[PDB]
Amino acid sequence: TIQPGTGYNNGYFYSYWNDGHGGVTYTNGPGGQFSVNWSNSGNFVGGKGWQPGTKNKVINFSGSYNPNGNSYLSVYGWSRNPLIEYYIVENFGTYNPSTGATKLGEVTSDGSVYDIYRTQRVNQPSIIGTATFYQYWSVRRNHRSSGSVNTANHFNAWAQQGLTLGTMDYQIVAVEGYFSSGSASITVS
């Protein structure tokens, strides 16, 4: 059970961030496992993965995801030059995290169609401090809390839509919460 920050645990990179609102407990377990239990949290994102990620990694995950309010489960990461924050949402509760974003197209990957969106983040926190950057989204229609994600499918889809990715920074399977409650346990490989 740790406080916000980044580091490595049992062979995997981990990142845990929150807005200073309590109600969140994030725990690193053996291997690629992590568990998050939250009660009336603010905004937070946490999970395990790689640093840096790659543009062709096949990500495997399995677990239990039970949100009660705004929250999502997804492959989450960044790239630099250009600075991009991206998500491959596998599951979510209450509100589609892509809301308000501009839909570009769709991609069929790993047993499901995903809706592709792009949106601009203005003067918001990032891996390099407060900045303006674009977010790329791929939201899975058939929600699941276990499976395999071929990231290359989504990056190629995004590219075909004119969305370009820079040099990859870290890449993880993360659980996010936004003023809600719930719990999750995820094992990445």
For 22-68, give the DSSP string.
Answer: --EEEEE-STTEEEEEESS--EEEEEEEESS--SS-EEEEEEEEEEE
Question: Is 144 annotated in some ligand binding site?
Answer: no
> Which residues are catalytically annotated?
85, 176
72 is known to lie in a ligand binding site:
yes
145: helix, coil or strand? coil
Domain 1-189, architecture per CATH:
Sandwich (2.60)
Annotation-wise, does 125 bind a ligand? yes
Give the method used: X-ray
Task: Say whether 135 counts as a known binding-site residue.
Answer: yes
Task: List all residues 6 or more positions away from 124 whose beta carbon is below 8 Å from its beta carbon.
Answer: 130, 131, 132, 133
Q: What is the Cα–Cα distance from 91 to 31, expressed in whole angstroms?
A: 22
Beta bridge partners of 44: 18, 177
Resolution of the PDB structure in angstroms? 2.0
Structure token digits, residue 51: 């640093």
CA distance 54 to 118: 20
Q: How far apart are CA 54 and CA 180, in angstroms?
A: 32
